[PDB]
Design a protein around this ligand. Structure first.
Ligand SMILES: CCCCCCCCCCCCCCCCCC(=O)OC[C@H](COP(=O)([O-])OCC[N+](C)(C)C)OC(=O)CCCCCCCCCCCCCCCCC
Ligand SMILES: CCCCCCCCCCCCCCCCCC(=O)OC[C@H](COP(=O)(O)OCCN)OC(=O)CCCCCCCCCCCCCCCCC
Ligand SMILES: NC(=O)C1=CN([C@@H]2O[C@H](COP(=O)(O)OP(=O)(O)OC[C@H]3O[C@@H](n4cnc5c(N)ncnc54)[C@H](OP(=O)(O)O)[C@@H]3O)[C@@H](O)[C@H]2O)C=CC1
Ligand code: SF4
Ligand code: SF4
Ligand code: SF4
Ligand SMILES: [Zn+2]
Lengths: 210, 176, 320, 388, 115, 158, 96
């Protein structure tokens, strides 16, 4: 807390607790946890080897000091610049201790991740979505299939290399008396504005030379 | 701090029980339900008479985009493409060339009233208060093409309503 | 080609083809496919009409924005005709009726109206033109529909000597009034009354086949001035067809309605065309010439009468 | 499985919650399984936002839950503020709270009424919707748009409240509580309503946590949890209101909880009007808050910052975060990811109705077919955010 | 190194098994599909189309990929079996309305720019 | 009595054109935010029912369809199916901006860029959402559009 | 000034017109090519020049917050009239 209305007041106490709670999980499951980091806005991050999805998520759900009962969110972040392009992310809640932790893995198109449905029933559908939109496959999922896209969508939309306008646009044809599909044609193309400023914005995050 | 919503214990005294027994065999609470409805029969309906009456609006209301002119008559827009670059739906198309007298002005200016989301960003980003949104909203058309407003249509609307657009902006330019 | 009609795009819905087509009588069964095919590739289309604008709505999805226009006109007038053809790269005449009214008899719809359109196109300097004649045209033919038709085939070949007159045989399709004519009209509430349909030979054609032919004709530069007829690939007998129809339609069969207001059904003169044989014209170029293959009636008769079929059928025997 | 039926809401009835294609597996009268299909409204919002500026993307969050608009924008705003490392001015935090409660009134009125519309109870739909109309004006008189105000933005709000508005919101609040008492006089004590939502869709406390429920679903079965009390964001730490808690777990309690939350909104508005402070409405950091037109048309720096913030937007520090609020339906949050550019890299939207719908299968076990009407309604499912 | 986690099939010999298992699944379903949706193509046509989509993937070699291609097939079939698809979705494999796209060189040079 | 053929047609044609517009039973497609306004338009303030426009009607006994909200590719086939089941006359009214040209989602792969592709629209109502009053203007406008129909006259002149 | 082409179509203040052969004008058939007759270029020329004392004069289009940004116009040169970039109103130094 400080007397500056245009800045965000830091809460260091909660930040210290996460760092203290940091090694707590790094020591307990060192077979999987690769990297644990804490962000300045009080959010804990745990980096786990993909195999340890069940050992780590199952632990926090039930341990006597984690007690993360509810799964807040489950998604993936496509990143085509890495060998493991995709990157799962689990957001966990803890009513007892009133805190949230984020657990991340890494996979690709052809390396499935064990379904976490056994750990949480919440991920019954979130795992369908990730497969549906990104293409990652989940092993042992009770029922894996498309949840969002249209039937027979020959592609995985949310991948960064999937054009925004798709590949086929529908229309109704009288000759055949049924909706049809054709290669996409746009009356007006999507204008692609270039916004990046050519001057370094934040020196703190500067990536060192190569 | 919380509270309990459904935690009442029915006291087992005869009189209380007889009430819950009285309620069932006489539908009293249902008779009460017919009461509230009866009252609303004798109230005054909140129905206005359209189109002879209109729903109250405010100076900030957003409606049919339009293009303004200075008091002299000149176009306010100077083809700065801020509105195009901010219209979230990319419903704005603009072109410009130096006019005969060498003044920056538009040549093609189009708003797609079907791609528009009526967000008000365009009137926020205009540095000269050229493109605005009039208080008109009754402009439904029988064809899709009619709802593609180009420069000529926008200018006419601005001239058409300018007697009112300024009146609203006058009362409200201070909050902005 | 004009500067604004140069081809552009990939021929999809919003691609520009360069064919500013003006279709007369597009509201009919044949037209809606021609409009749809023209709309498919995004060609500019003007559609004069006489009925309510409501009746033209189903054409709207068939065209992109600003590609379909619904003017007004009247056959008895030529001032209206000129507007619709002032800047058309081609003009198509599809007018016609299966019965006569007290306003426009067979000659008016088959002689003057086809002509009046032809002259204005010449006057306006239309670069091309298409005309739908009937395969069985002959001034000595019995069917006044045909006798009236036979007159039109001459003036159109004269007023617009380069107009590609086309003479298709009986056409069938989803909305056709030939296959649907036998199934419902002939039988419903009435036992078949075929007058010894043993000699007649009928060689119908599929509507899609005709539609593809017309477009190919427009593109071709050498098709100017010629004359075509479209006929199915397999000939048939009238009696054989009707019997086979009830197999697909699964209606009871027993081998062997006046003229009124509204749209009459089973008209006096219409009969003559059902009995009238399909001419054999081996010398006239047909569908196969337009890069179009006739689709056998066996393949496509299933869809048309599927609705007639309430809620493993040997194809009809052919006759050489 | 005996006879699976594709119960469809595609021919949508007057409920205005979306279009739902439902595939079930009955056993005679009783339902035995369910399988909602939710792709019917997926527009791809979560993908377009990757092409917009953080400012341009704001209107999308308005169209996720199209009955809890300003609450949605607040959820997005907090996420950007958190990554921007700046705080909205104290006056802004009250306005946003002032409308969060008003929005929560809007949401519940739709939820309770339509939930009663589906069960044939049709009169309560209108009475309360009239108040929705009056509340729309407050939306309209501040932002000029009846529903998709986009009033709340990263850094506070856009325009200050017009004169005579707070003095008119007070008029609405004062008489409002009489409106609810009329509503209860036909739903709570009515025996027909009780027969439909008591011992129906009972959710066990442990399961609610496991399936990932939040909001009136969690608090409808005893669980004491409300982010307005444990993780306050703007000013909720500076107001007094009692989080209603049910015990039975059936639908009836959730109906009671929602009606009780609306009353607890009035107890808050009464405190927002009296405690509203003075000052500016947006962060006085021009690089994030575009200046008012007065300074833009007069000062050099004031113009440039109005020439970049409407063509390129504001850069955000690289990072990612998950921020959530007690939206009317339940927990709502976004996993925004920023890579340093003025456009978000990724934005996952945790729709509270997404989990509450997947759990429909669990809740629907062993209930008649007609009870799915009173089960889907009690969850307050709007398919705007289910599909996004 | 090539140490990679497999999905279902540890080698092509097992992987190719499900392909033949899958082909029978379609081959025996095409007759149902035509009647179920009341399509207007003979049972013969469907299987011929089916072979094409299988045939175009003959060049595949990766055990994982064939598992993936197979995994999609079951979903496509399951929707077809359960009638989740709709008459429209079934015919999207045949491309009726699409006019013949030219493919030889001189055809392209007369119509447009696409190589 | 006396009157020419043209005159008697107009008056008895004027009747039906009045019946078919004084009593519209609109099917509603509440697909997105603009569905809410359709509810307000029926709410007490405007009371669309006061013009005879009833609130609910069986989709197979409708009189006009008001496409309200976005039209996803997945949901498109259902819309067309419903359209074909509407007995004639059937007037389709596009409501909002995502039901006209894709609105905010014009460039979304899974959005039908304008419902007009799937069906022929009669009245286009702009605004996302179109204020509950504007929508009412369209419905009133539609009745006039009906009032400018001359079926029988055209029939008498066939 | 609305000067029409020989073909009979009006010409906008941007000069665009569908010339004789173009088919695109067919759309207007039965309808009208809506044009705005208050040509901007003409009206400004009507407005008169203004005489000022110092070399620099400030323009804001009148109304302050309701006009275009503030711009300062040099007027040293006398062989021409200074012009405001946004609104176009002219200024000139007097008797010098
Ligand atoms: C002759 C019998 C033939 C068989 C017909 C069927 C059996 C008889 C049933 C008749 C029912 C009576 C219908 C009366 C309709 C009057 C409507 C009305 O009130 O006027 C207001 C209407 C309302 O107009 P509006 O729709 O534009 O109103 C706009 C909205 N307000 C009013 C709020 C601003 O006025 C009209 O538009 C003109 C109505 C013309 C009605 C023509 C039919 C008359 C009946 C036939 C008689 C012909 C006699 C021979 C000639
Ligand atoms: C109908 C006219 C509108 C009636 C207005 C409501 C009213 O006057 O009666 C309400 C009264 C209250 O009943 P209640 O709220 O349940 O409290 C008592 C608990 N035993 O409930 C009553 O006491 C009404 C009892 C009516 C008599 C029972 C019905 C008899 C029907 C046959 C005559
Ligand atoms: N099945 C067949 O008969 C075959 C086709 N043809 C020819 O193809 C042409 C088109 O086929 P089809 O669509 O089935 O014919 P239609 O019966 O559907 O009529 C075609 C068009 O002509 C219009 N029409 C009728 N009278 C007039 C009139 N006085 N003035 C202007 N338009 C009028 C009709 O409009 P409206 O409905 O409002 O009157 C309609 O739009 C026919 O002319 C036919 O001679 C040739 C060989 C076989
Ligand atoms: S209101 Fe918004 S979406 Fe509509 S034209 Fe203006 S900036 Fe574009
Ligand atoms: S922001 Fe205003 S001045 Fe700039 S181009 Fe748009 S309308 Fe013209
Ligand atoms: S048209 Fe309007 S109400 Fe409908 S989905 Fe689009 S923005 Fe929402
Ligand atoms: Zn100036």
């Amino acid at each position: 807390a400080d007397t500056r209305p245009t800045v965000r007041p830091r809460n260091d106490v909660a930040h210290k607790q996460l760092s203290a709670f940091g090694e707590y999980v790094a020591e307990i499951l060192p077979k999987y946890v690769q990297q644990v980091q804490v962000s300045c806005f009080n959010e804990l991050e745990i980096c786990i080897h993909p195999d340890g999805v069940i050992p780590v998520l199952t632990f926090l759900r039930d341990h006597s000091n984690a007690q993360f009962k509810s799964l807040a969110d489950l998604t993936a972040v496509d990143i085509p610049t890495r060998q493991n392009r995709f990157e799962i992310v689990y957001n966990l809640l803890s009513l007892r201790f009133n805190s949230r932790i984020r657990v991340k893995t890494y996979t690709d198109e052809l390396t499935p991740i064990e379904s976490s449905v056994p750990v949480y029933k919440a991920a019954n559908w979130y795992e369908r979505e990730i497969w549906d939109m990104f293409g990652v496959f989940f092993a042992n999922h009770p029922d894996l299939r498309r949840i969002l896209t249209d039937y027979g969508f020959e592609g995985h939309p949310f991948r960064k290399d999937f054009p925004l306008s798709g590949y086929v646009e529908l229309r109704y044809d009288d000759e055949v008396k049924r909706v049809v599909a054709e290669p996409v044609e746009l009356a007006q193309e999507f204008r692609k504005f270039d916004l990046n400023s050519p001057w370094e914005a934040f020196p703190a995050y500067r990536q060192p030379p190569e | 701090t919380y509270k309990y919503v459904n935690l009442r214990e029915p006291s087992m005294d005869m009189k209380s029980v007889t009430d819950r027994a009285a309620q069932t065999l006489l539908w009293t609470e249902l008779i009460r339900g017919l009461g509230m409805t009866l009252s609303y029969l004798f109230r005054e309906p909140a129905t206005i008479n359209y189109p002879f009456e209109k729903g109250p609006l405010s100076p900030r209301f957003r409606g049919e985009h339009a293009l303004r002119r200075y008091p002299s008559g000149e176009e306010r827009c100077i083809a700065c493409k801020l509105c195009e670059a901010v219209c979230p739906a990319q419903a704005i198309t603009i072109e410009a060339e130096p006019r005969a007298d060498g003044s920056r002005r538009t040549t093609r200016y189009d708003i797609d009233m079907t791609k528009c989301i009526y967000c008000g960003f365009c009137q926020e980003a205009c540095p000269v208060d050229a493109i605005v949104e009039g208080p008109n909203f009754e402009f439904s058309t029988e064809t899709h093409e009619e709802l593609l407003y180009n420069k000529e249509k926008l200018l006419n609307n601005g001239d058409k309503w300018e007697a009112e657009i300024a009146a609203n902006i006058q009362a409200d330019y201070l909050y902005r | 080609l004009h500067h604004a009609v140069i081809p552009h795009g990939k021929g999809g819905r919003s691609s520009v083809s360069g064919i500013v087509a003006t279709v007369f009588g597009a509201t009919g069964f044949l037209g809606r496919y021609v409009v749809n095919h023209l709309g498919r590739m995004g060609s500019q289309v003007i559609v004069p009409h006489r009925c309510e604008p409501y009746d033209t709505m189903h054409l709207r999805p068939m065209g992109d924005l600003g590609q379909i226009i619904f003017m007004d006109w009247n056959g008895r007038d030529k001032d209206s005709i000129r507007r619709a053809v002032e800047h058309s790269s081609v003009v198509i005449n599809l007018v016609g009726r299966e019965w006569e009214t007290q306003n426009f008899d067979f000659e008016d719809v088959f002689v003057k109206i086809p002509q009046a359109i032809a002259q204005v196109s010449k006057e306006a300097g239309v670069e091309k033109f298409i005309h739908i004649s009937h395969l069985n045209a002959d001034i000595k033919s019995s069917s006044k529909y045909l006798r009236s038709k036979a007159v039109g085939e001459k003036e159109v070949r004269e007023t617009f000597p380069e107009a590609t007159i086309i003479k298709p045989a009986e056409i069938f399709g989803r909305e056709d009034r030939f296959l649907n004519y036998f199934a419902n009209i002939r039988w419903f509430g009435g036992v078949p009354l075929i007058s010894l349909g043993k000699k007649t030979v009928k060689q119908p054609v599929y509507i899609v086949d005709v539609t593809k032919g017309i477009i190919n004709a427009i593109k071709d530069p050498d098709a100017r001035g010629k004359t075509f007829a479209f006929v199915g690939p397999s000939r048939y007998l009238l009696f054989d067809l009707v019997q086979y129809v009830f197999a697909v339609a699964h209606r009871p069969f027993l081998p062997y309605f006046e003229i009124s207001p509204f749209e009459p059904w089973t008209t006096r003169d219409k009969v003559e065309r059902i009995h009238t044989t399909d001419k054999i014209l081996p010398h006239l170029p047909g569908l196969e010439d337009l890069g179009v293959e006739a689709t056998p009636l066996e393949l496509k008769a299933i869809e048309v009468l599927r609705r007639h079929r309430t809620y493993d059928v040997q194809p009809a025997k052919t006759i050489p | 499985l005996v006879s699976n039926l594709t119960l469809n809401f595609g021919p949508q009835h007057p409920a205005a919650h979306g279009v739902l294609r439902l595939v079930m597996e009955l056993s005679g009268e009783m339902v035995r399984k369910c399988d909602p299909h939710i792709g019917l409204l997926h527009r791809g919002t979560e993908k377009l936002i990757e092409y917009k500026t953080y400012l341009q993307a704001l209107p999308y969050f308005d169209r996720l839950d199209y009955v809890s608009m300003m609450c949605n924008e607040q959820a997005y705003s907090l996420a950007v503020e958190k990554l921007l490392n700046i705080r909205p001015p104290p006056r802004a935090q009250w306005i946003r709270v002032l409308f969060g409660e008003i929005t929560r009134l809007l949401n519940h009125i739709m939820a309770v009424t339509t939930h009663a519309l589906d069960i044939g109870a049709m009169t309560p739909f209108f009475w309360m919707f009239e108040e929705r109309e009056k509340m729309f004006e407050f939306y309209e008189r501040v932002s000029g748009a009846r529903m998709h105000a986009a009033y709340v933005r990263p850094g506070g709000v856009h325009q200050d409240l017009p004169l005579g508005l707070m003095d008119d919101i007070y008029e609405f609040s004062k008489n409002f509580s009489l409106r609810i008492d009329e509503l209860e006089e036909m739903l709570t004590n009515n025996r027909i309503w009780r027969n439909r939502t008591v011992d129906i869709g009972i959710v066990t406390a442990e399961d609610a946590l496991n399936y990932g429920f939040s909001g009136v679903m969690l608090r409808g079965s005893g669980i004491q949890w409300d982010l307005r009390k444990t993780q306050p964001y703007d000013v909720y730490d500076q107001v007094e209101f009692d989080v209603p808690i049910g015990s039975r777990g059936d639908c009836y309690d959730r109906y009671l909880c929602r009606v009780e939350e609306m009353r607890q909104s009035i107890r808050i508005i009464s405190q927002c009007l009296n405690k509203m402070p003075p000052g500016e409405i947006k962060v006085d950091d021009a690089k994030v808050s575009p200046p008012k037109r007065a300074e833009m048309k007069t000062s050099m720096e004031s113009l440039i910052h109005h020439f970049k913030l409407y063509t390129e937007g504001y850069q955000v520090p690289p990072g990612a975060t998950y921020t959530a609020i007690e939206a009317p339906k339940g927990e709502f949050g976004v996993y925004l990811v920023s890579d340093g550019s003025s456009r978000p890299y990724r934005c996952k939207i945790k729709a509270p109705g997404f989990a509450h719908l997947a759990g429909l299968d669990k809740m629907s076990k062993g209930h008649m077919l007609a009870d799915v009407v009173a089960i889907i309604g009690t969850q307050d499912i709007v398919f705007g955010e289910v599909d996004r | 190194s090539t140490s990679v986690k497999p999905i279902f099939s540890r080698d092509m010999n097992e992987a190719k098994r499900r392909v033949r298992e899958l082909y029978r699944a379609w081959y025996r379903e095409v007759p149902n599909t035509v009647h179920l949706f009341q399509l207007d193509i003979s049972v013969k046509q469907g299987r011929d189309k089916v072979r094409e989509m299988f045939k175009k993937n003959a060049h595949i070699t990766d055990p994982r990929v064939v598992d993936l291609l197979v995994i999609k097939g079951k979903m496509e079939l399951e929707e077809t079996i359960k009638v989740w698809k709709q008459r429209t979705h079934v015919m999207r494999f045949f491309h009726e309305t699409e006019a013949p796209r030219p493919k030889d060189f001189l055809s392209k040079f007369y119509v447009g720019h696409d190589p | 009595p006396s009157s020419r053929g043209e005159y008697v047609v107009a008056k008895l044609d004027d009747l039906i054109n009045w019946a078919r517009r004084s009593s519209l039973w609109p099917m509603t497609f509440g697909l997105a935010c603009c569905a809410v306004e359709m509810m307000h338009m029926a709410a007490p303030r405007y009371d669309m029912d006061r013009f005879g426009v009833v609130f609910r009607a069986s989709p197979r006994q409708s009189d006009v369809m008001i496409v309200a909200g976005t039209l996803t590719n997945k949901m498109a086939p259902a819309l067309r199916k419903v359209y074909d089941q509407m007995p004639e006359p059937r007037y389709v009214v596009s409501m909002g901006s995502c039901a006209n040209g894709g609105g905010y989602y014009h460039y979304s792969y899974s959005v039908v860029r304008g419902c007009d592709r799937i069906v022929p629209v009669d009245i286009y109502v702009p605004g996302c959402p179109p204020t509950a009053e504007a929508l009412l203007y369209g419905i009133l406008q539609l009745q006039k559009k009906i009032k400018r129909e001359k079926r029988l006259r055209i029939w008498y002149r066939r | 000034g609305v000067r029409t082409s020989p073909t009979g179509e009006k010409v906008t203040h941007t000069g665009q017109v569908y010339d004789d052969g173009d088919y695109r004008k067919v759309r207007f058939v039965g309808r009208q090519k809506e044009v705005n007759e208050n040509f901007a270029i003409d009206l400004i020329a009507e407005q008169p020049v203004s005489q000022v004392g110092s070399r620099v004069i400030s323009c804001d289009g009148g109304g302050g917050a309701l006009g275009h940004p503030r711009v300062y116009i040099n007027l040293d040169k006398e062989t021409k009239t200074g012009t405001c970039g946004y609104c176009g109103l002219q200024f000139r130094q007097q008797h010098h």
